Paper text:
NA, which is a sialidase, catalyzes hydrolysis of terminally linked sialic acid and functions as the receptor-destroying element of [name] and B viruses. Additionally, [name] NA is further classified into two groups: group 1 (N1, N4, N5 and N8) and group 2 (N2, N3, N6, N7 and N9), based upon primary sequence. Group 1 NAs contain a 150-cavity (formed by amino acids 147–151 of the 150-loop) in their active site, whereas group 2 NAs lack this cavity. NA inhibition assays were carried out and complex crystal structures were solved for laninamivir, laninamivir octanoate, zanamivir and oseltamivir in order to elucidate the structural basis of their inhibition.
Therefore, we also solved the p09N1 oseltamivir complex structure at a resolution of 1.7 Å. Binding of oseltamivir to p09N1 was indeed highly similar to the binding observed in previous reports and is also similar to the binding mode of laninamivir octanoate to p09N1. As observed in the other available oseltamivir-NA complex structures, in the p09N1-laninamivir octanoate complex structure, Glu276 indeed forms a salt bridge with Arg224, creating a hydrophobic pocket which accommodates the hydrophobic oseltamivir pentyl ether group. This hydrophobic side chain of oseltamivir is favorably parallel to the Cβ and Cγ of Glu276 on one end and at the other end is pointed toward the hydrophobic Ile222 side chain, which contributes significantly to the high level of oseltamivir inhibition. Oseltamivir contains a 4-amino group, instead of the 4-guanidino group found in zanamivir and laninamivir, and is actually more similar to the natural ligand in this regard. Therefore, the orientation of the 150-loop during oseltamivir binding is not a major factor. Instead, the binding preference of oseltamivir for p09N1 over p57N2 and N5 may be instead explained by the ability of Glu276 to adopt the conformation that is critical to accommodate the osetalmivir pentyl ether side chain, which replaces the glycerol moiety of zanamivir, laninamivir and sialic acid. The observation that this Glu276 conformation occurs in the p09N1-laninamivir octanoate complex, but not the p57N2-laninamivir octanoate complex may indicate that this conformation is more stable in p09N1 after ligand binding which may explain why inhibition of p09N1 by oseltamivir was the best relative to N5 and p57N2. Oseltamivir inhibited the activity of N5, p09N1 and p57N2 with IC50 values of 0.83 nM, 0.54 nM and 0.79 nM, respectively.
Author numbering:
A (entry chain A), B (entry chain B), C (entry chain A), D (entry chain B): 82 to 169, 169A, 170 to 306, 308 to 333, 335 to 336, 339 to 392, 394 to 412, 412A, ...
Write the structure that this text describes.
Amino acid sequence: SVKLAGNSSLCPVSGWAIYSKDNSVRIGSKGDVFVIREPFISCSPLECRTFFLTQGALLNDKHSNGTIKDRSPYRTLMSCPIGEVPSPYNSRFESVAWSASACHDGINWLTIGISGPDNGAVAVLKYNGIITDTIKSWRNNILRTQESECACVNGSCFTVMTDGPSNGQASYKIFRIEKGKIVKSVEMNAPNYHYEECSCYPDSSEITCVCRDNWHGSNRPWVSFNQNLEYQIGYICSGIFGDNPRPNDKTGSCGPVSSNGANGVKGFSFKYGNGVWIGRTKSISSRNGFEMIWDPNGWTGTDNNFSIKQDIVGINEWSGYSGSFVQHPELTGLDCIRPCFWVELIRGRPKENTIWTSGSSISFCGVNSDTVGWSWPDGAELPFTID
Amino acid sequence: SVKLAGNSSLCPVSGWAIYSKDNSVRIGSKGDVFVIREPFISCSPLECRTFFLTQGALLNDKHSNGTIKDRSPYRTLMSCPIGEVPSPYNSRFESVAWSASACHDGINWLTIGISGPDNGAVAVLKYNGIITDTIKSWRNNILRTQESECACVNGSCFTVMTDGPSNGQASYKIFRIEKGKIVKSVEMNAPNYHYEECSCYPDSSEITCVCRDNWHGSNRPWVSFNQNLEYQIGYICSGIFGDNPRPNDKTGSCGPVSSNGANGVKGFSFKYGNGVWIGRTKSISSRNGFEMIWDPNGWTGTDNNFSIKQDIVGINEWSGYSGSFVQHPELTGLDCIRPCFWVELIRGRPKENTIWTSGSSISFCGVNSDTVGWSWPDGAELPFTID
Amino acid sequence: SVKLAGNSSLCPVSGWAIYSKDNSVRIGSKGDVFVIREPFISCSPLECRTFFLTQGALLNDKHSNGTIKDRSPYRTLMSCPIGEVPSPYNSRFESVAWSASACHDGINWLTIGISGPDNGAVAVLKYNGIITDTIKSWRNNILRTQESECACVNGSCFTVMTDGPSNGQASYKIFRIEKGKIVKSVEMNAPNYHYEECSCYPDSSEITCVCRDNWHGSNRPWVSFNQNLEYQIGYICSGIFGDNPRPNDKTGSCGPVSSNGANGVKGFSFKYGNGVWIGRTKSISSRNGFEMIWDPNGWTGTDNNFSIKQDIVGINEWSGYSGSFVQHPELTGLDCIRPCFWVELIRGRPKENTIWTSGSSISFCGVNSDTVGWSWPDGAELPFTID
Amino acid sequence: SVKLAGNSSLCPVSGWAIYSKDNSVRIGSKGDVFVIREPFISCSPLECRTFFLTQGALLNDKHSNGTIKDRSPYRTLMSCPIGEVPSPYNSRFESVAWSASACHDGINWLTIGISGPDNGAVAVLKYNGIITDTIKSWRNNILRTQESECACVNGSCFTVMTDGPSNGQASYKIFRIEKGKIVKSVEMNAPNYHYEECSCYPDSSEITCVCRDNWHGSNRPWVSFNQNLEYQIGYICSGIFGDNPRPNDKTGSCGPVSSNGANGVKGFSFKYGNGVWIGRTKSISSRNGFEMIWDPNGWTGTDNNFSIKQDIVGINEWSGYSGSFVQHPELTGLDCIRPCFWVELIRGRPKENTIWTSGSSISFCGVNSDTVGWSWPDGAELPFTID
Ligand SMILES: *[C@@H]1O[C@H](CO)[C@@H](O[C@@H]2O[C@H](CO)[C@@H](O[C@@H]3O[C@H](CO)[C@@H](O)[C@H](O[C@H]4O[C@H](CO)[C@@H](O)[C@H](O)[C@@H]4O)[C@@H]3O)[C@H](O)[C@H]2NC(C)=O)[C@H](O)[C@H]1NC(C)=O
Ligand SMILES: *[C@@H]1O[C@H](CO)[C@@H](O[C@@H]2O[C@H](CO)[C@@H](O[C@@H]3O[C@H](CO)[C@@H](O)[C@H](O[C@H]4O[C@H](CO)[C@@H](O)[C@H](O)[C@@H]4O)[C@@H]3O)[C@H](O)[C@H]2NC(C)=O)[C@H](O)[C@H]1NC(C)=O
Ligand SMILES: CCC(CC)O[C@@H]1C=C(C(=O)O)C[C@H](N)[C@H]1NC(C)=O
Ligand SMILES: CCC(CC)O[C@@H]1C=C(C(=O)O)C[C@H](N)[C@H]1NC(C)=O
Ligand SMILES: CCC(CC)O[C@@H]1C=C(C(=O)O)C[C@H](N)[C@H]1NC(C)=O
Ligand SMILES: CCC(CC)O[C@@H]1C=C(C(=O)O)C[C@H](N)[C@H]1NC(C)=O
Ligand SMILES: *[C@@H]1O[C@H](CO)[C@@H](O)[C@H](O)[C@H]1NC(C)=O
Ligand SMILES: *[C@@H]1O[C@H](CO)[C@@H](O)[C@H](O)[C@H]1NC(C)=O
Ligand SMILES: *[C@@H]1O[C@H](CO)[C@@H](O)[C@H](O)[C@H]1NC(C)=O
Ligand SMILES: *[C@@H]1O[C@H](CO)[C@@H](O)[C@H](O)[C@H]1NC(C)=O
Ligand SMILES: *[C@@H]1O[C@H](CO)[C@@H](O)[C@H](O)[C@H]1NC(C)=O
Ligand SMILES: *[C@@H]1O[C@H](CO)[C@@H](O)[C@H](O)[C@H]1NC(C)=O
Ligand SMILES: *[C@@H]1O[C@H](CO)[C@@H](O)[C@H](O)[C@H]1NC(C)=O
Ligand SMILES: *[C@@H]1O[C@H](CO)[C@@H](O)[C@H](O)[C@H]1NC(C)=O
Ligand SMILES: [Ca+2]
Ligand SMILES: [Ca+2]
Ligand SMILES: [Ca+2]
Ligand SMILES: [Ca+2]
Ligand SMILES: [Ca+2]
Ligand SMILES: [Ca+2]
Ligand SMILES: [Ca+2]
Ligand SMILES: [Ca+2]
Ligand SMILES: [Ca+2]
């Protein structure tokens, strides 16, 4: 076993090839499948796994009642091989958690699981399944983290956590973790910024995170930093707004776009020079549809012009959270870090007449060969027998 | 790990010994078993696996509704150990696909999964579960492939794909793939020929494929080629017609036999000099029964005489697709490549009054010791509780 | 990996310690558990597994209907770790079979599975899951075998098969198998003897089998042989009759005991000099209860006196088949071959008012430390919801 | 593989971080989950496992009827990865048992499973799944053991067993076990003491056990011993009484506290010099709630003052058994033995109107970083559909 270098650049990509689809909700109609949300993908040098937050209950069972609720003592972080349904019969237990992150440094898995009360939550860090550290809420207001993979470079892994209001100024910290131990942290000096649920990836020995402004921005905030946690911050400038909800496309801003800025959804983007690959819902008002857009000057430019659009989920179909994940050369044999992404397909409450809320997933990887747009939706027929 | 040589000849065989039976549909009446079709077997130097195209749903669940449908965003290629039922709890995810192929080169698994719209489908190639290449539809008319194992020789794997009409002249291409990367391809110059769903096997460093003419041939077309993709084409001459539907046996043709030539079923045959082992349905008009026939001059001779017939499935029982698979000396310890075959036993629509369509499987391997004919049918009692 | 020596003697034992219990029928009431019969245990140098003949159906499902039937194309030999329920989710597929045997030579598993028509059945032999040989019925009357583990000595494995009437003189053959290949066989010259379902074990480089006389013997026939298949035959002389049905205990015979001699049940015994450990039902008329009896001169003596009796299953509880299995020094680290045994607990038809027949299992190993008698019955409550 | 040294001291700890939660009962409402009680955790140098005593039945099935019953022939010791639900599809079979213990010596698993009649029960010892020894009841009155992990030091493992009345003076023995073989035992000379269900852990090459006085003590008895079984005995002196039921906290005793002394619950404590970490229910009269208390002089001091209290389960929630388990440096890479604990959350009879009784589990590990109290209850809604 050797630790991931993380020193190569992102692979340039022209399109996205479908990588996985689990059909979790369809199968859970009869099969024993966990009620889950906040799924994400992360890979080791050997395999890729789907991580997810269970509700400690199964689909089509009475205990799925009220699962629109975000935090409870019953939620646990678990994982299974990519593309398989999250079942009690194929899932590895990771941590007790209602907010989480995970990543592999080349040697072992790091998992971060936050549980406990809203006014004093504690993140439990595990390395190879052994508790190695903890960090407790510093603002006493729902300590929370990525809900996607952390990023590793030369034996160090990095994540971002938030503590404070979800509708106003909060506090944001970056962490450097080695063998499950926090070796350094810094609080971001980001007045008037809002960071939630960051999607972080490694690129040329540094980390880039694209996050969610739940306070007053319909474009996405970003933070980038080196291994010493020296950071820069900003917002994606493109007039192709990335959050949901959001305004119709027009002239963007390199600061938070106030129009339709409140609320949001976890998302991601990949930076290539001044350009950006943007993943976003198709609807401006609800979590419906999904598309990938290549905007060659969208990181720093404010116009609403773009070069490529690829359909992922039809506008009449439910989507939800999305996040980045990468495949290192140690896994692929390539000379660059390959960008991939996943999409959570949320079914149930609040928009559908069920007693439960749960999601399935799809994932794609970036390639330079031919690709095609389509719609790969959840496909479940609601309501269920339980309702 | 070492590459399969694929340079020895096919083992001569006098009969077929039963190798596996999964009873998938019988078990799916209660258990959690995928709705599937287009199953096939492929082996590594260590194990044999059953691959299959799920419908992203389980038997006896409402989501099995309308699974007579061939192509959808929900279909996925998965695999499980041979003889086991295809379940969410024992199946490995391979690819998102409504048409597929797979094979092992001695080092890693190659999988090919085609998804996307009918007018621009994309084949995604994976090597050891990592995307290594893609190929997009070139005729914009349902890019499709074998639905059985590809064939590997000295580190190169080979497959055939079709694009264009299924009821007239189409386009057929042969591919050479190394470590999941397409290194060469050629379009077959085959006017008045039709190739669908090829069953390909290695033999003395070259590849032989026996396929399905869905246009105007009740005998089977074949294509053989060396590692450089230098090919030959023809039709099996035997008056023992191999396709379904077909006419009663009589004088055959070395070209397409037009009588009952439209439509068909995936099948296979093994060539031994001028002779051929033919696997076929027992019924000339429907997918019922199965039998193996040895015809000592059937590859090139047009008479309807044969030497050996072995019963596999009774004529009053449902059958379906069939395909070849081989076991290499690297797996068996033999000095030749052993021929085996599988049969898909289709239940449900359109011939049965259910809301669903699904199949189970049986498989056999060629031996020179004593064997016996019998009937090993699906055995499920329809309809089910869901209907 | 090294082949088992099989050259040491049986470990002397004073009693039997419970080793496993699967509770299959109890669990199958809700869980997905195969309908099975004819289970048996066999061990490798690393683990012990339960082999069994499925009916290609699950408990409490309609396809369990009529499973009193012995032979069908749907029956398959499968295996799982000892003590676990036989489920589609934890069972390895072995062979298509309605009669079977299996054993490990120290290097790989040998399995023997008989399927096909009653008038021409074929035994398929597999070594490490690869077909290595076949043997076809020679009397055209239900070729059949042990339904328990074969016996291995220095790289050779041995079994017994029967072909012919089950109610009169039949034909019995011994086989020597190396790496799945039959290298020698001999037909036993046994006029007026009847051998069915032999329980065979290795002891001092030779094989001893205790079997079932279904024709006209209420005591058990035996056959012993060396690696060259030079054999001796006889019947257990003890007045403690071992079969079921049988007469009340009295003066025995070294030939077949005609009284209540027709019919029978698979059983076993362990020979120690002139002494014998006898496992048998508690009832003389039905498959109820089970007990182990140490009879210090019972192999050759005809009296009905014994020294030790240990209860295994209460007389008011269902039992069924029983068989021997051994643990070699290569597995245990002992300087002798340890004797163990299993008992099949049959539930359902014909004695119970259900539509199905299925069994669970218990097993015990011989020790020289303290033990105790008790009753470890199936424990299921019949009928089931399916009936 | 190398033997665990067990020669380092316990890691000092300031609080407890949550390690696992299985949600077994919630999931068993639909999924196939064993009815269990008496769960416990034990680790090897590679992984941690949950052991448990099944009732040979699944939740929400009719065979769960009457599972308040403690001892039957159907109960089995099985294990699964920590945090996973105990299911037939993910559980390893260990032994037939209605009382049990297990631990890993660094090389292999030792399991101890007691079954048989109340008047002559037999403990079966297995090393790497092979029977290595047995010990039979010496008082003919329910031979019984820890219901938690045994303790290993330098290749020797240690446990405590009890035989005799559970409501008066009984007999208590300490055992030293090497490779599954009992090499030494001693009967504790403990007049007026009562020992049940000991929680034992290694510390500086010696063993410390904290147990349950079911006769006449509301504080917990303890026994400590070296590898030669030279022992000391006493009771925890703290006025913070550890058993359930118990009186309100007040002046304690270094002998058995008679007030509310009859009956009790399995529990644990960790000794640090004169101090003690006490785990106990929150209710003084029933198995409700759970908390960890640090009492700096509680081992030898009788006052009712303490320094730290951490909530684990709310007082309005069901708890049950609790036990210690440790993680050795060979597993963690630390320079000390890390203390952890588990809690059984019992649902059903006798306090709830169901036909069944079963439990789920949570576990925590000691750390010196920040922690938080909360409530992590079972969370199931009773009754179930079966009742
Ligand atoms: C998922 O959760 C939902 C929400 O809880 C749940 O729907 C609810 O079911 C309960 C129980 O049937 C309903 O509660 C009843 O409401 C009526 C008025 O509509 C009251 O009169 C009832 O109270 C009477 O009866 C009680 C019990 O005998 C007495 O204790 C009480 O004093 C009264 O006599 C009772 O409260 C509730 O109305 C619904 N809510 C909604 C929005 O439908 C649903 O059943 C859950 N689904 C599953 C599968 O668990
Ligand atoms: C397990 O198998 C058993 C045995 O087959 C099965 O019990 C049987 O169920 C069938 C179907 O209900 C019964 O068959 C009927 O018998 C009656 C006389 O009792 C006949 O009148 C019926 O025939 C009429 O209806 C048919 C269908 O419409 C017509 O085709 C026919 O011409 C007549 O009009 C019919 O044959 C049978 O009586 C029972 N047998 C016993 C012994 O109970 C059971 O249902 C199976 N269980 C499961 C779970 O599958
Ligand atoms: C508490 C702030 C946070 C970010 C805005 O809220 C989230 C919004 C979510 C959503 O918009 O779907 C669901 C989340 N599981 C949640 N996180 C937690 C810890 O509750
Ligand atoms: C589209 C042409 C093709 C070959 C004739 O049709 C097939 C016939 C099939 C059939 O005759 O059963 C079902 C197939 N799954 C299918 N392949 C795809 C891709 O839909
Ligand atoms: C056919 C002869 C044979 C031995 C008497 O009958 C058996 C009796 C059995 C029994 O007495 O329970 C059930 C068996 N599964 C069976 N074997 C086969 C192959 O059918
Ligand atoms: C027989 C004495 C013993 C300890 C007091 O009783 C126990 C109390 C238990 C309890 O208080 O919950 C349940 C146990 N499973 C049990 N142990 C056995 C073996 O039946
Ligand atoms: C990337 O990391 C590897 C491994 O340490 C190193 O050998 C290599 O020089 C680095 N590549 C570049 C371009 O710096
Ligand atoms: C087949 O390939 C093997 C491995 O390269 C080689 O050793 C052998 O000579 C070849 N056999 C023939 C007949 O060419
Ligand atoms: C099957 O599909 C048809 C067409 O939509 C629908 O009417 C019917 O309700 C479906 N059946 C089930 C059981 O869902
Ligand atoms: C097999 O492939 C290797 C690598 O390309 C090549 O060197 C060798 O000649 C090939 N063997 C044969 C028999 O063609
Ligand atoms: C048993 O077999 C072993 C392994 O071959 C051999 O070394 C040994 O001598 C044999 N033991 C006896 C008692 O013959
Ligand atoms: C503990 O045991 C290890 C392994 O034998 C040994 O190296 C070490 O010296 C011991 N530690 C102490 C403090 O005795
Ligand atoms: C539970 O056991 C009692 C006593 O035998 C019995 O009356 C009742 O029917 C059982 N309940 C179920 C659901 O089996
Ligand atoms: C550990 O056990 C070994 C083998 O018995 C022994 O030689 C050694 O002295 C022991 N170590 C300690 C620290 O006692
Ligand atoms: Ca926003
Ligand atoms: Ca732009
Ligand atoms: Ca089920
Ligand atoms: Ca045709
Ligand atoms: Ca011919
Ligand atoms: Ca008889
Ligand atoms: Ca005698
Ligand atoms: Ca007490
Ligand atoms: Ca104190």
